[PDB]
Design a protein around this ligand. Structure first.
Ligand code: MG
Ligand code: MG
Ligand code: MG
Ligand code: MG
Ligand code: MG
Ligand code: MG
Ligand code: MG
Ligand code: MG
Ligand code: MG
Ligand code: MG
Ligand code: MG
Ligand code: MG
Ligand code: MG
Ligand code: MG
Ligand code: MG
Ligand code: MG
Ligand code: MG
Ligand code: MG
Ligand code: ZN
Lengths: 137, 190, 115, 176, 76, 47
RNA sequence: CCUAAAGAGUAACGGAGGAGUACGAAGGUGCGCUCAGACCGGUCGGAAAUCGGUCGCAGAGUAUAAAGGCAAAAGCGCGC
RNA sequence: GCUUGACGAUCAUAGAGCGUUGGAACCACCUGAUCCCUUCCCGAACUCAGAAGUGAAACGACGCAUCGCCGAUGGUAGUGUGGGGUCUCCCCAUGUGAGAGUAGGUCAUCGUCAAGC
């Protein structure tokens, strides 16, 4: 799917997901966007599932941008294994999402077609979304 | 048309500004520029949101009415809630007859359907940008800068230097030796 | 130019040592036509005594040689005494301690002030 | 030799030939450095003592031998052992070296229509090579080893290469 | 796991802050390298330890080119 | 100029077979004869 | 070095790496000097050898990991 | 007060870049390498003896905001204490309050000494 070509370190701490998205919250490339209104986490197979559904619906023209990149590795512990014995191995890559972040953008289509193409995408994502339009400020 | 009502603000801070947006439905603001000191004001959220539905809100002169004294300003910046999208703060720039000022002016693309690159080669018009930043005198600030794409073929790129501007208007970015793409014609996605 | 710029870089270590020790200094300047000597108090701020070839009894015409540097050296030592100073440190200001600079220093030693 | 020659007509003529308002900024040549980078002696180290002796004859100043500044395994060398030698010429030696190379040996090289004007950098210095070490009249033909590629480099006080070329219009430079 | 190693802590940092009264020989800073430089009345150890050579008060001033941080002793 | 390390330098005697003579200094200490010189070369005059 | 919560300290079969040496000069001192890289020009080398010039200023270097330092260079060379 | 040199205070609001200008003195370039001294070669640099030429190069002075560097007011983020919620995150009362950006500034300001007015 999507993941870094190479990274400095294999593993990472869990951390916390706090705050609003004051950066990456504007429509910068296209004319309409899908924007997160709740916080959460996107697992790079939901991003691919939602990209096919969006692109398969337009099927005639239109440019699409993906503004999210999953760069945080998460580990899992195999089943029937006790606590301890070192950290688990990396299983999938994921992205942190704060309220207000733009996920996908599109242009070159009508407002009515984009609005129903973004509805198909939002049905694959585990977080609340909204439809927004580009503004001067 | 372009008129806004404001009241002087005197209780400043984070706690006071949060009470404005819950209890009273107001919006904190500030007016600076000219040769005068800045001034904190308040204005209704419903009034500012209604004026901003207009297209040329940021490229037109606005008559501000603080108390009873009127003054000429221009929307310079605007803070929005990242999630809900409503306006939380606004700052205005005082307008003086002889003083160059910087504004953001939207672009208008016309005759897209009759473009050479579209009807002949089946290309698609892509808008790389949608507004440009200009500097000029207040008396000749344009509401929108015109760009046409009739004589554009497949693969041709439109730059800042190509488009013409009203007399007395400077493109700023072109002045700093950096012309940026505006639009192009490219081959179809599928 | 590079010629002067590299000399000031060459003279910084000795000057910074004297500020640390807070000792009186005897600074020398040498040009193609004259030579200079100054006694600077403890921190580069004030000049106590001075002597050069521009005094109105040495402006005779030949000031860019060795013996001209000898007369100023034995003249700056006299002026240092009037200021009640001895026990200074010689600062060559990046010039090599070989020629006109050396002849200047020997006159000061004979003049009475001791390094 | 060529000292007085430069200041009798070459310097006075170039003053008003480019229409100068002052006299020092007329181009003059400061130094000539020979250099000859011995690609061989990678491991043998048997031509340095031979390259030192021959290069002495052309000039008469004891040469200095240069060392590798890096490793670069592609040439199977590394820093520490020398790869080439060089000499620097100034004032009288480099003038008298010029005329001897100008025409005592340069006409009798082999085949040459002249010295091209394309061997100029962007500032006004000239560089040109020499394909055989025996070309000069200071050495023999039999007691000398095989071909060695001696070089010539010129350095002038020219702002740009055109008046550097103009200065080299004098000195009887075979420029085509 | 092949990671379980670490070294003992070295207890570095500032030992006397600005305004404090000092005596000759007092250690002022424990360092790696010179985050702070020796000013007036301050010496430097072979492991870059700043120590007092006079009696007075710590100063902690930034001055000169290079934007260096200096520690010096002044009159109380 | 460093001494004892620079070998003998002199004015020699140069004489081209065409009668051309230029007194230039070199390091041979003997007269030399030239078959060709600047006054008799095809490239210097357009041959 | 991170965890370690802007003084110190701080655990886990937590996340990452090194050591069990070297040097009689690789120590002391006086004197002197600045790198990597790029471009142009130049015999066999040609993107990369040595040479000339301009820019560059530390993107080099530091016996040995990483961190903190380095123009009075703590980097480089020579005499004693 | 005016100009030039030496040494400092202060380390970009003081820097870079562009243009103009300075030889009366000073400074710089300059001539030569006998003599002290020097180059792992070269009087290039260090040094010695002055002085015929020039302000070209360098340096200084004066202009310009183009780049750099400074930079508010207001708002926002975070946060100590007390209290709430729908409690992986927030809200209220009270105290505190950035970074970024915006309007806009900047072609420095001083001290001692010596030579000429
Ligand atoms: Mg955890
Ligand atoms: Mg606030
Ligand atoms: Mg609060
Ligand atoms: Mg030193
Ligand atoms: Mg530790
Ligand atoms: Mg010690
Ligand atoms: Mg701590
Ligand atoms: Mg802590
Ligand atoms: Mg600890
Ligand atoms: Mg414990
Ligand atoms: Mg060492
Ligand atoms: Mg390091
Ligand atoms: Mg040594
Ligand atoms: Mg603020
Ligand atoms: Mg609390
Ligand atoms: Mg604040
Ligand atoms: Mg700020
Ligand atoms: Mg800033
Ligand atoms: Zn002949």
């Amino acid at each position: 799917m999507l993941q870094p070509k190479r990274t400095k370190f294999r593993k990472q701490m869990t951390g916390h997901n706090r705050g609003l998205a004051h950066r990456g919250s504007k429509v910068s490339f296209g004319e309409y966007a899908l924007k997160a209104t709740s916080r959460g986490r996107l697992t790079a197979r939901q991003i691919e599932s939602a990209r096919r559904a969006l692109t398969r619906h337009v099927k005639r023209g239109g440019k699409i941008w993906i503004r999210v990149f999953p760069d945080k590795p998460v580990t899992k512990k195999p089943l029937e294994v006790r606590m301890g014995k070192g950290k688990g191995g990396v299983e999938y890559w994921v992205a942190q999402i704060q309220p207000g972040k733009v996920l996908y953008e599109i242009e070159g289509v009508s407002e009515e077609l984009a609005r129903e193409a973004f509805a198909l995408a939002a049905a694959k994502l585990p977080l609340a979304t909204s439809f927004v339009k580009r503004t001067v400020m | 048309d372009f008129i806004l009502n404001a009241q002087v603000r005197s209780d400043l801070g984070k706690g006071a500004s949060r009470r404005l947006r819950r209890n009273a439905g107001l919006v904190p603001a500030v007016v600076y520029g000219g040769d005068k000191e800045p001034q904190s004001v308040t204005l209704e959220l419903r009034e500012i949101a209604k004026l901003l539905e207009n297209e040329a809100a940021f490229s037109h002169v606005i008559a501000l009415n603080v108390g009873g004294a009127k003054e000429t300003v221009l929307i310079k910046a605007l803070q929005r809630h990242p999630a809900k999208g409503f306006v939380m703060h606004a700052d205005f720039l005082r307008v003086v007859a002889d003083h160059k000022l910087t504004a953001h002016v939207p672009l208008h693309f016309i005759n897209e359907e009759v473009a050479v690159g579209v009807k002949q080669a089946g290309g698609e018009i892509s808008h790389t940008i949608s507004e440009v930043e200009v500097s000029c005198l207040p008396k000749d600030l344009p509401e929108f800068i015109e760009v046409d794409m009739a004589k554009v073929e497949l693969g041709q790129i439109v730059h800042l230097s190509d488009l013409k501007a009203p007399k007395g208007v400077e493109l700023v970015q072109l002045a700093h030796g950096n012309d940026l793409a505006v639009a192009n014609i490219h081959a179809s996605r599928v | 130019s590079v010629k002067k710029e590299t000399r000031l870089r060459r003279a910084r270590k000795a000057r910074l040592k004297m500020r640390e020790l807070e000792t009186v200094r005897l600074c020398v300047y040498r040009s193609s036509q004259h030579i200079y000597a100054q006694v600077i108090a403890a921190d580069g701020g004030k000049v106590l005594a001075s002597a050069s070839t521009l005094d109105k009894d040495l402006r005779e015409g030949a000031t860019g040689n060795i013996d001209a540097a000898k007369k100023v050296g034995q003249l700056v030592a006299e002026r240092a005494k009037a200021a009640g100073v001895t026990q200074v440190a010689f600062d060559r200001s990046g010039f090599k301690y070989h020629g006109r600079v050396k002849a200047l220093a020997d006159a000061a030693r004979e003049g009475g002030l001791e390094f | 030799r060529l000292k007085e020659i430069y200041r009798k007509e070459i310097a006075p003529k170039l003053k008003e030939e480019l229409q100068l308002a002052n006299v020092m900024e007329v181009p003059r040549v400061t130094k000539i450095t020979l250099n000859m980078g011995l690609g061989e002696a990678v491991g043998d180290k048997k031509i340095i003592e031979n390259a030192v002796a021959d290069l002495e004859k052309i000039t008469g100043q004891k040469p200095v031998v240069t060392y590798a500044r890096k490793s670069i395994a592609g040439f199977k060398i590394r820093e520490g052992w020398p790869i080439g030698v060089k000499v620097t010429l100034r004032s009288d030696r480099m003038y008298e070296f010029l005329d001897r190379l100008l025409s005592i040996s340069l006409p009798r090289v082999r085949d040459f229509r002249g010295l091209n004007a394309k061997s100029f950098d962007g500032r006004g210095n000239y560089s040109m090579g020499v394909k055989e070490q025996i070309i000069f009249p200071e050495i023999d033909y039999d007691k000398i080893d095989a071909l060695r590629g001696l070089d010539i480099t010129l350095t002038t006080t020219a702002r740009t290469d055109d008046e550097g070329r103009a200065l080299l219009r004098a000195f009887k430079f075979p420029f085509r | 796991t092949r990671n379980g190693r670490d070294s003992e802590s070295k207890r570095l940092g500032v030992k006397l802050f600005g305004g404090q009264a000092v005596k000759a020989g007092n250690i002022l800073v424990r360092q790696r390298g010179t985050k702070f430089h020796a000013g007036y009345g301050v010496g430097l150890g072979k492991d870059h330890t700043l120590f007092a050579k006079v009696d007075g008060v710590v100063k902690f001033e930034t001055k000169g080119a290079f934007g260096r941080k200096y520690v010096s002793i002044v009159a109380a | 100029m460093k001494a004892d390390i620079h070998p003998t330098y002199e004015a020699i005697e140069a004489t081209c077979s065409c009668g051309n003579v230029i007194k230039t200094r070199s390091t041979l200490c003997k007269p030399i004869h030239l078959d060709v010189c600047s006054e008799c070369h095809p490239f210097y005059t357009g041959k």
